[PDB]
Swiss-Prot record:
<feature type="domain" description="GH84">
    <location>
        <begin position="116"/>
        <end position="383"/>
    </location>
</feature>
<dbReference type="InterPro" id="IPR015882">
    <property type="entry name" value="HEX_bac_N"/>
</dbReference>
<dbReference type="GO" id="GO:0042802">
    <property type="term" value="F:identical protein binding"/>
</dbReference>
<dbReference type="InterPro" id="IPR048162">
    <property type="entry name" value="O-GlcNAcase_BT_4395-like"/>
</dbReference>
<dbReference type="InterPro" id="IPR051822">
    <property type="entry name" value="Glycosyl_Hydrolase_84"/>
</dbReference>
<feature type="binding site">
    <location>
        <position position="360"/>
    </location>
    <ligand>
        <name>a protein</name>
    </ligand>
</feature>
<feature type="binding site">
    <location>
        <position position="123"/>
    </location>
    <ligand>
        <name>a protein</name>
    </ligand>
</feature>
<dbReference type="GO" id="GO:0102571">
    <property type="term" value="F:[protein]-3-O-(N-acetyl-D-glucosaminyl)-L-serine/L-threonine O-N-acetyl-alpha-D-glucosaminase activity"/>
</dbReference>
<comment type="function">
    <text>Can hydrolyze the glycosidic link of O-GlcNAcylated proteins. Can use p-nitrophenyl-beta-GlcNAc and 4-methylumbelliferone-GlcNAc as substrates (in vitro).</text>
</comment>
<keyword id="KW-0378">Hydrolase</keyword>
<dbReference type="InterPro" id="IPR029018">
    <property type="entry name" value="Hex-like_dom2"/>
</dbReference>
<comment type="subunit">
    <text>Homodimer.</text>
</comment>
<feature type="binding site">
    <location>
        <position position="332"/>
    </location>
    <ligand>
        <name>a protein</name>
    </ligand>
</feature>
<dbReference type="InterPro" id="IPR017853">
    <property type="entry name" value="Glycoside_hydrolase_SF"/>
</dbReference>
<dbReference type="GO" id="GO:0005975">
    <property type="term" value="P:carbohydrate metabolic process"/>
</dbReference>
<feature type="binding site">
    <location>
        <position position="270"/>
    </location>
    <ligand>
        <name>a protein</name>
    </ligand>
</feature>
<feature type="region of interest" description="Catalytic domain">
    <location>
        <begin position="115"/>
        <end position="400"/>
    </location>
</feature>
Amino acid sequence: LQPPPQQLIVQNKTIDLPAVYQLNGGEEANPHAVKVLKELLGMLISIGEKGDKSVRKYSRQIPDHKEGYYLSVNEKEIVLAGNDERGTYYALQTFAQLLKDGKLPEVEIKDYPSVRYRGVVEGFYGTPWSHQARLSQLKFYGKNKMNTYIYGPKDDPYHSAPNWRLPYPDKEAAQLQELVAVANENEVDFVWAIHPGQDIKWNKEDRDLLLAKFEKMYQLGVRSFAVFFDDISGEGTNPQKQAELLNYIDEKFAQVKPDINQLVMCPTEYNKSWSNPNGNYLTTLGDKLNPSIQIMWTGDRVISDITRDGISWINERIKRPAYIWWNFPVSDYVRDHLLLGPVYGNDTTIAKEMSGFVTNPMEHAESSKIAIYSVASYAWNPAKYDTWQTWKDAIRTILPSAAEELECFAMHNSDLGPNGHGYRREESMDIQPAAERFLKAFKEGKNYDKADFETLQYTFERMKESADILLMNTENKPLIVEITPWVHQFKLTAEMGEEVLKMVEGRNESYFLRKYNHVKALQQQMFYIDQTSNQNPYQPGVKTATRVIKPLIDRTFATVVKFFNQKFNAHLDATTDYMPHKMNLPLQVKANRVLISPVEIELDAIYPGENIQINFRLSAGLQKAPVKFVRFQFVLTIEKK
Ligand SMILES: [Ca+2]
């Protein structure tokens, strides 16, 4: 069961879903729960919320907690009893997971969430999720008992500056209206966020425009609102003015409408490292913001895991439990990586110190469901949170037909590589020791263990199988579309590892040379993918298996070529990444830029020059002049483009 319930007693008996059943409470129970139940399916089945006639007998079994429920299955009856309407829906989401092949385990569950608000913030930079992706997400959240979706894509012009002031055009407004309706059907609070801070004026015109925009969103069905002041500069960072705006929204709108739910703000100082401990920003918000307004927080850094000491620090200043904005699996600063590994690092004992916990995901929506599912599990029952089981459970849920293949792929696509936020994840941990030994031995001319070579061999083989099967999988086409470039790159990685290992075994000179040439071609193939796929402005291209596998392959290749060159007095090139241009630092190609990893460069052809940046604030336009050689950051830009 995911999330795992707070309390579970199993009887080691099974029953059959009743082919004939009596349904008690269908007319008075949450209609969303009743629809699920009727889809799933005499023996009595009692469904309802505390206070309903149908569940009077179980009133003392029903947890006295928001979103709590009692679920019972035995020989004589099935009970699905919520403390509230959302609890009833959640009982059904647990019920659906117990049902296997027309059979039910005999069980009694008392369940409720440890964290009040649980969900996703679509709060990233990059291409906002598609409408269809969002529809799919909302269903996924209901299944996993996530009750919150915060809509705030940084690159939505009607969310951020300057068009936050403008109502959505009709097409987008209709789409938003449909998302809210689907959210509500799935027991998810659609929270519409606004990000006005970069150009807001602290005057009546803009205050009214803001309230007017919120009114428009209310007309589309929105009942929870957020104001985001993150990643801005200027007068919009003023905490007194921020708190006054939020309190006005609360007092003139949120407390005035019949049916508003959450009001949330994201501060400008939204993590410890971005906060001024000697400044008044956070204490001003904490003292001045009305107590019903939630304040968001990403931890000790922009990207960090949530610790007891960290959350203590913020809670003391804001005078309320922080609403956590967790910046994983968001990849908008390492866009060339997929972050498909487990969710871990967050303290499992601090539920009481948070008002909420939401994950900021990748611009790859389906891919993000691995982490989302795991966050849902963590947020509902942090005490019982099991990192690796939940990750496996997520994968089997996402892609049942190829779960082992998706596990293979995800386990080697977890780390972020080096980055300005200093955040890293484990990757390829299984084979890391065998890799580390093999390379240690091989480099120093000691004999490597056969089992380690065999493990590397097995892994590369499993990677190719996984890649080919995932490419062709039709159970979740949108997921496969998202990951496809990385899958191609992952396959090439595995093929390259297989050939490098054949070089290590090195039967004869001729065979070695064949493998060496094959490896050079695969290097070039990886370059082409890195240049043709995922060509975004910031971290273009496709990286995979970066932490352990690619380094092992590259260093082994460089080593065996060195030994070949000694033994045969040869001059084979031992470089590990393909580069078509020539220049000890490696050149790099990013989009239409040719770049020395921080005297003379020769391009593989003549191009119109755009400009050189250098930096030891040097810049020069080349006015479309033909250029093949350049003699002297160090970045030539060309028309390519
Ligand atoms: Ca009811």
